[PDB]
Amino acid sequence: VLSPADKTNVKAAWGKVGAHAGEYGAEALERMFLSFPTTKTYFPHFDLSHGSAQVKGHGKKVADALTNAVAHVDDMPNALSALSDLHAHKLRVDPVNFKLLSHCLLVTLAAHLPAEFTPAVHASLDKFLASVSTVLTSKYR
Amino acid sequence: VLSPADKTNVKAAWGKVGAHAGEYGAEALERMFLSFPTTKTYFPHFDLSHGSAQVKGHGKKVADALTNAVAHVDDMPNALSALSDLHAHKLRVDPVNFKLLSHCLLVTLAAHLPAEFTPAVHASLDKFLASVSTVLTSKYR
Amino acid sequence: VHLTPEEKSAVTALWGKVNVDEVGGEALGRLLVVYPWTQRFFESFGDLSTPDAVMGNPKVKAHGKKVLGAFSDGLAHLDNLKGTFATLSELHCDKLHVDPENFRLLGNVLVCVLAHHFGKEFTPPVQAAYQKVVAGVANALAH
Amino acid sequence: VHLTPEEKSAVTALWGKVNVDEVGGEALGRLLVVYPWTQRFFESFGDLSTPDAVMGNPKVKAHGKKVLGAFSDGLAHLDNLKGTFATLSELHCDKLHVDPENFRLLGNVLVCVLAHHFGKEFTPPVQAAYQKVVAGVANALAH
Ligand code: HEM
Ligand code: HEM
Ligand code: HEM
Ligand code: HEM
Ligand SMILES: O=Nc1ccccc1
Ligand SMILES: O=Nc1ccccc1
Ligand SMILES: O=Nc1ccccc1
Ligand SMILES: O=Nc1ccccc1
Ligand SMILES: O=Nc1ccccc1
């Protein structure tokens, strides 16, 4: 379970992210597609080139979903219910891929928030993203 | 979340395990120590030889913990609370090692329950053991 | 990988008794049932609707034979698994380029299936020898 | 591993600017903070009781230098990582025989630290090249 200090650390880092949330999501996705090219197979219909409006729009969706989880951090299974069914039951995403995206989200925050990404906040953000990943992988059939 | 069919499947397999629960736990541990020798480093003070009374006794403790989880399958964070603190906080068990023991528990049930270990029951038992493993790894600091 | 002589013996003697027409389909099929995202790797294989449907699918059963064949080839060339499997991975284009973890999952399902079929004979030392082989074949096939 | 020339360039140019006295300690230290079970592997290293303590521990910082050294050795011999690291693993007796996942965790913490220290310069293509190297060094060091 996330501690009070984890919840504070996550909310603080999102606060500092501010309105860049959408752009950082897009960047995390691009980092994922280049570093871990097997993840591109879930997006065969997207243009994955740099500056792609489709990656930009999808990165905003992902960031908005993370923010919803942040905003309902003690009710994440209910809040993410529809997205868990989509990823696990409909799209059949390999659960390994959530570790890869979480890593790329961390790298993105580190590359934009040098002061905020202390070891303690890094540990809190990792725990939070692993909790989101656990929810999104909870409904395989 | 475990489904009603998972809960029935797990309880049915435990039912057929019956009083062999303790011996099967010991067997799973031996399987884990031989197959994955890094796990022995958590038991440097045990005699790990075949037939070891220390492995037999510990296997009964592990089976009894799993049976407690089965018996309180909708309250597993509370029921396993003391054991999560022991494994994560005090012993600092690498979380990979729970996947290894879970695998060896499955192999043990398969080797003793040829009729019960259908594909559907196999999937239910895997899900159950992963849920236990998630609880036992939940309290790292 | 290097197996000791008793390890090689443990693998070889039980492997000679495996029903090579069914054990592969059982393992590949249980992979799809227990780890449902693996069905996406096999969209070209037809109906994978239910456990009963997965287990009965003929292309599952056919590629199951092929998985055992890959195991036997591995046991035959344990000291050069990459040279054994190079043409096997390449003939698939990018079909084998999934996370190495899924090859470890298949190998461990195979182990569960061998325990299921051999019971007491699949002793802990026998399992440990097979775990060495399935780990090496997983690493080479994922390269 | 094989790196393209652009990938080799992406790694080499940024690697030349790394503070070799600090970045290793920061990555090794964050490993122990973020994944607390890794402290068990370094119980011989003294006080690892809090983030600040971990990050200031002198043997953390010292072996952190050695982690970068292993990266530099790897980058210098990408086509024979096992021959590069054979002496390194063997001089350690059993100390490096932990799950390969922890070497992948270390490599990804190092990536996070490089992103932290280089900001915008640690572009997505630069990260992708580093991920190839840290994956190769991880596989060899766990062998
Ligand atoms: C932090 C983890 C994740 C979050 C918060 C997240 C969030 C979302 C959201 C909000 C959507 C809906 C987009 C829309 O309705 O327009 C979506 C869809 C999708 N997700 Fe994820 N996702 C995550 C992880 C992943 C991963 C790791 C993969 C695969 C590598 C993946 C693959 C997909 C795909 C293929 C779609 C459908 C894309 C399309 O065709 O429009 N997701 N996700
Ligand atoms: C299904 C997962 C597990 C269950 C249900 C479980 C259960 C238990 C229980 C009940 C005890 C207490 C024994 C006692 O107080 O006498 C214990 C202790 C212990 N566990 Fe586990 N355990 C699990 C997984 C693991 C794994 C994967 C490891 C390491 C590879 C591990 C290492 C230990 C150790 C070292 C102790 C202390 C042993 C001693 O010194 O007596 N456990 N566990
Ligand atoms: C996962 C481990 C796999 C192994 C060990 C394996 C093994 C093999 C082997 C040995 C062949 C050579 C033909 C033969 O000897 O009969 C082959 C061919 C082939 N494989 Fe696989 N395979 C695997 C996965 C897959 C996957 C995921 C696909 C995706 C559809 C696939 C599709 C094919 C196709 C289309 C052929 C050509 C012959 C045919 O089936 O029509 N295989 N495979
Ligand atoms: C995790 C990756 C590790 C790497 C890459 C690494 C690297 C090295 C290198 C390069 C050397 C000797 C040459 C030199 O200092 O330049 C060395 C020696 C040594 N290492 Fe490690 N090491 C690692 C982990 C560990 C661990 C986990 C331990 C102990 C728990 C350890 C303990 C030692 C000791 C005791 C020595 C030699 C005596 C000394 O210098 O105090 N190392 N290591
Ligand atoms: O983010 N920087 C950019 C790089 C190339 C084109 C546009 C933007
Ligand atoms: O031994 N047969 C295997 C095939 C694929 C992955 C792992 C094992
Ligand atoms: O995609 N190839 C596979 C790898 C491991 C198991 C099954 C399929
Ligand atoms: O390249 N540096 C690494 C050292 C140890 C493990 C992984 C990466
Ligand atoms: O084997 N020792 C390790 C220590 C830290 C990270 C990875 C491996």
PDB file of C-alpha atoms in Angstrom, chain A residues 24 27 30-32 34-36 99 103-104 106-108 110-120 122-123 126, chain D residues 30 33-35 51 55 101 107-109 111-113 115-120 122-125 127-129 131-132:
ATOM      1  CA  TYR A  24       5.665  14.312 -20.963  1.00  0.00           C
ATOM      2  CA  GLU A  27       7.743  11.782 -24.581  1.00  0.00           C
ATOM      3  CA  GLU A  30       8.405   7.814 -27.681  1.00  0.00           C
ATOM      4  CA  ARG A  31      11.070   6.689 -25.219  1.00  0.00           C
ATOM      5  CA  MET A  32       9.222   3.382 -24.899  1.00  0.00           C
ATOM      6  CA  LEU A  34      12.550   3.539 -29.349  1.00  0.00           C
ATOM      7  CA  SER A  35      14.057   1.735 -26.345  1.00  0.00           C
ATOM      8  CA  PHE A  36      11.717  -1.285 -26.414  1.00  0.00           C
ATOM      9  CA  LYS A  99       7.196  -2.103 -16.385  1.00  0.00           C
ATOM     10  CA  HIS A 103      10.473   3.039 -16.494  1.00  0.00           C
ATOM     11  CA  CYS A 104      10.136   5.473 -19.393  1.00  0.00           C
ATOM     12  CA  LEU A 106      10.382   7.809 -14.599  1.00  0.00           C
ATOM     13  CA  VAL A 107      13.148   8.660 -17.097  1.00  0.00           C
ATOM     14  CA  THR A 108      10.938  11.459 -18.495  1.00  0.00           C
ATOM     15  CA  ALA A 110      13.999  12.728 -14.218  1.00  0.00           C
ATOM     16  CA  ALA A 111      14.879  14.518 -17.462  1.00  0.00           C
ATOM     17  CA  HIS A 112      12.499  17.411 -16.794  1.00  0.00           C
ATOM     18  CA  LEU A 113      12.414  17.690 -12.967  1.00  0.00           C
ATOM     19  CA  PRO A 114      16.049  17.579 -11.750  1.00  0.00           C
ATOM     20  CA  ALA A 115      15.201  19.093  -8.333  1.00  0.00           C
ATOM     21  CA  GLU A 116      12.061  17.060  -7.639  1.00  0.00           C
ATOM     22  CA  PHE A 117      13.490  13.634  -8.598  1.00  0.00           C
ATOM     23  CA  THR A 118      15.211  12.958  -5.279  1.00  0.00           C
ATOM     24  CA  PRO A 119      15.817   9.305  -4.297  1.00  0.00           C
ATOM     25  CA  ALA A 120      12.794   9.417  -1.961  1.00  0.00           C
ATOM     26  CA  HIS A 122      11.923   8.343  -7.200  1.00  0.00           C
ATOM     27  CA  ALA A 123      11.041   5.491  -4.828  1.00  0.00           C
ATOM     28  CA  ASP A 126       8.109   3.854  -8.796  1.00  0.00           C
TER      29      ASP A 126
ATOM     30  CA  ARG D  30      19.167   4.658  -5.662  1.00  0.00           C
ATOM     31  CA  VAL D  33      16.590   3.015  -1.830  1.00  0.00           C
ATOM     32  CA  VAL D  34      14.081   2.140  -4.532  1.00  0.00           C
ATOM     33  CA  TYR D  35      14.426  -1.681  -4.355  1.00  0.00           C
ATOM     34  CA  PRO D  51      18.009   7.415   1.772  1.00  0.00           C
ATOM     35  CA  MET D  55      23.509   7.904  -0.619  1.00  0.00           C
ATOM     36  CA  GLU D 101      16.416  -9.067 -12.900  1.00  0.00           C
ATOM     37  CA  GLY D 107      20.950  -0.707 -15.419  1.00  0.00           C
ATOM     38  CA  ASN D 108      17.591   1.067 -15.465  1.00  0.00           C
ATOM     39  CA  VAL D 109      18.398   3.043 -12.318  1.00  0.00           C
ATOM     40  CA  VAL D 111      19.513   5.207 -17.040  1.00  0.00           C
ATOM     41  CA  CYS D 112      17.328   7.237 -14.658  1.00  0.00           C
ATOM     42  CA  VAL D 113      20.422   8.838 -13.132  1.00  0.00           C
ATOM     43  CA  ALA D 115      18.436  11.277 -17.422  1.00  0.00           C
ATOM     44  CA  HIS D 116      18.546  13.179 -14.122  1.00  0.00           C
ATOM     45  CA  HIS D 117      22.047  14.511 -14.746  1.00  0.00           C
ATOM     46  CA  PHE D 118      21.736  15.291 -18.453  1.00  0.00           C
ATOM     47  CA  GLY D 119      18.119  16.437 -18.773  1.00  0.00           C
ATOM     48  CA  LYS D 120      17.177  17.302 -22.360  1.00  0.00           C
ATOM     49  CA  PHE D 122      19.394  12.400 -22.648  1.00  0.00           C
ATOM     50  CA  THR D 123      17.078  12.305 -25.657  1.00  0.00           C
ATOM     51  CA  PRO D 124      14.843   9.326 -26.481  1.00  0.00           C
ATOM     52  CA  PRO D 125      17.295   8.031 -29.129  1.00  0.00           C
ATOM     53  CA  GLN D 127      18.234   6.484 -24.022  1.00  0.00           C
ATOM     54  CA  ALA D 128      17.446   3.749 -26.560  1.00  0.00           C
ATOM     55  CA  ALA D 129      21.156   3.178 -27.278  1.00  0.00           C
ATOM     56  CA  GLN D 131      19.186   0.559 -23.034  1.00  0.00           C
ATOM     57  CA  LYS D 132      20.900  -1.768 -25.512  1.00  0.00           C
TER      58      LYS D 132
END
